[PDB]
Design an enzyme around this catalytic site. Sequence first.
Site, PDB file in Angstrom:
ATOM      1  N   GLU B  44       0.334   4.546   0.150  1.00 47.62           N
ATOM      2  CA  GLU B  44      -0.792   4.286   0.746  1.00 47.62           C
ATOM      3  C   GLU B  44      -1.471   5.428   1.135  1.00 47.62           C
ATOM      4  O   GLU B  44      -2.533   5.382   1.313  1.00 47.62           O
ATOM      5  CB  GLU B  44      -0.492   3.485   2.207  1.00 47.62           C
ATOM      6  CG  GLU B  44       0.091   4.146   3.214  1.00 47.62           C
ATOM      7  CD  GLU B  44      -0.084   3.538   4.503  1.00 47.62           C
ATOM      8  OE1 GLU B  44      -1.122   3.148   5.199  1.00 47.62           O
ATOM      9  OE2 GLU B  44       1.129   3.043   5.275  1.00 47.62           O
ATOM     10  N   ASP B  73      -5.282  -2.902   5.916  1.00 44.69           N
ATOM     11  CA  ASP B  73      -5.134  -1.495   5.645  1.00 44.69           C
ATOM     12  C   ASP B  73      -6.497  -0.806   5.631  1.00 44.69           C
ATOM     13  O   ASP B  73      -6.856   0.166   6.134  1.00 44.69           O
ATOM     14  CB  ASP B  73      -4.257  -0.820   4.681  1.00 44.69           C
ATOM     15  CG  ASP B  73      -2.678  -1.321   4.781  1.00 44.69           C
ATOM     16  OD1 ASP B  73      -2.374  -1.454   5.989  1.00 44.69           O
ATOM     17  OD2 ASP B  73      -2.021  -1.569   3.964  1.00 44.69           O
ATOM     18  N   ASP B  89      -5.242  -4.575   1.125  1.00 43.85           N
ATOM     19  CA  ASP B  89      -3.703  -4.273   1.703  1.00 43.85           C
ATOM     20  C   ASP B  89      -2.688  -3.862   0.621  1.00 43.85           C
ATOM     21  O   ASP B  89      -2.962  -4.429  -0.269  1.00 43.85           O
ATOM     22  CB  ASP B  89      -3.346  -5.404   2.554  1.00 43.85           C
ATOM     23  CG  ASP B  89      -2.427  -4.945   3.764  1.00 43.85           C
ATOM     24  OD1 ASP B  89      -2.945  -4.243   4.728  1.00 43.85           O
ATOM     25  OD2 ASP B  89      -1.234  -4.880   3.687  1.00 43.85           O
ATOM     26  N   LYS B  91       0.841  -3.275  -0.831  1.00 45.40           N
ATOM     27  CA  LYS B  91       2.313  -4.053  -0.968  1.00 45.40           C
ATOM     28  C   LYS B  91       3.225  -3.132  -1.720  1.00 45.40           C
ATOM     29  O   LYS B  91       2.666  -2.881  -2.812  1.00 45.40           O
ATOM     30  CB  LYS B  91       2.281  -5.328  -1.099  1.00 45.40           C
ATOM     31  CG  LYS B  91       1.264  -6.085  -0.429  1.00 45.40           C
ATOM     32  CD  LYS B  91       1.696  -6.066   1.181  1.00 45.40           C
ATOM     33  CE  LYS B  91       0.687  -6.949   2.108  1.00 45.40           C
ATOM     34  NZ  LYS B  91       1.063  -6.709   3.563  1.00 45.40           N
TER      35      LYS B  91
HETATM   36 CA    CA Z   1      -0.795  -3.284   5.660  1.00 46.66          CA
END
Ligand code: CA
Lengths: 229, 236
Positions: B44, B73, B89, B91
């Site tokens: 991320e 996010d 988001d 993952k």
């Molecule tokens: Ca997240």
Amino acid sequence: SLRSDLINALYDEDVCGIISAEGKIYPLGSDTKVLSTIFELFSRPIINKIAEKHGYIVEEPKQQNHYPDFTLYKPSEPNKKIAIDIKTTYTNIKFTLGGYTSFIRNNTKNIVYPFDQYIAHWIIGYVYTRVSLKTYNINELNEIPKPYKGVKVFLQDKWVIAGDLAGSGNTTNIGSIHAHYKDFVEGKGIFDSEDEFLDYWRNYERTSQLRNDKYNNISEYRNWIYRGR
Amino acid sequence: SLRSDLINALYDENQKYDVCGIISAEGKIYPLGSDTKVLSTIFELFSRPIINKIAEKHGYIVEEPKQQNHYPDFTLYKPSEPNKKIAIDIKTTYTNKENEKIKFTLGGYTSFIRNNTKNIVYPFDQYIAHWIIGYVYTRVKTYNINELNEIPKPYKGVKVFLQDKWVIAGDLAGSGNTTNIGSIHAHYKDFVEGKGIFDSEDEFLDYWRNYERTSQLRNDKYNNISEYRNWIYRGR
DNA sequence: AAGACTCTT
DNA sequence: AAAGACTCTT
Ligand SMILES: [Ca+2]
Ligand SMILES: [Ca+2]
């Protein structure tokens, strides 16, 4: 000793980003999900150098949901394993210290080695004070903004710092004392011994409802022992 | 499009770069661990710049959660259309050998999807799409900058995809106590191609908003897509 | 105090 | 599989 050397090494040892083989540096996020994994990574070199010097083997878990982060031991003395686990939280304090329904109630659940083989459970706690979407190059290192205003660490036995109120609800974690940084460093807990810490958390009820007829805090558990459990 | 560019930019950087450690402003480098708690964090951090570059390129503003337990996010939106927000988001999951079936946990099914404002940066209704950037990696001392080329990496391969949440959503929970939706249990190609089990985002949403928390509770309602369809057929 | 935010068998 | 292991915010 191992413990005092580790403590000194820890204080002795500023992470500002992740770097790729190609030399590009991505900055850090400002949350504990991020920082907790950084602090853990930042500590491994230290733990291993020190253990190394004292003749201990360091060992990390294979399964990802196993305690502790680092298992230390001499091959001659195997039933004297030390458990070290990193815990992080922030300031602008209290920690979550693990489950109370796993290895402490069941000798082999989610633990690298059977719980009776550990003679010590140390917690290395990091506390950071909460304060870029671009990438950097090795040389702009001093321009990258840190995601924390500062950081403090300490090593302490898990029992000494454990509190009497749960740290998490559905993930049933032990909460630690809610004290100033100093109290954790000095070791001013509430349990008279580790034997009391263990008994208390092995019999703590999961929710308020069932706890109400047993004990919800330290005074009550003590009143529960008098009554005959 | 944004969707096409983003995928291209992600697939691009992924091949051109291999993250190898964390670094101190004092030039010391620390290696990474081969666990997802570690990799999800890395991935991320490694995506923020790419999503932000590609986003600016299309006039989109980018916002990250302010509170630590909020989704998603990344919220993307043009200031001219703030009611057509995009949620992205990240993952992550791992595999022990390339080509095996994988599965992701896709978020709670009792929070924002059931309560328009529980744990989400903006009310669930202001989002027009929910994208999932899934990363799959095959699991496998300090260093100085002049050694970057020698630090061992904690994974052998890393694949990435971008797909809609409803498209890859499965019909079995991804976690018990933390009540997460579980993705389809399939090969990476099915995630890229979008070979799901749901027919529409409405069906995905209705199935998950009525999914009971325990097997005992579900045994009398529905436990999989089939039973859920019969359930619907009979009048619920 | 309870419930939000990937893995293991 | 389903259930339960592995810091934060009301
Ligand atoms: Ca997240
Ligand atoms: Ca741990």
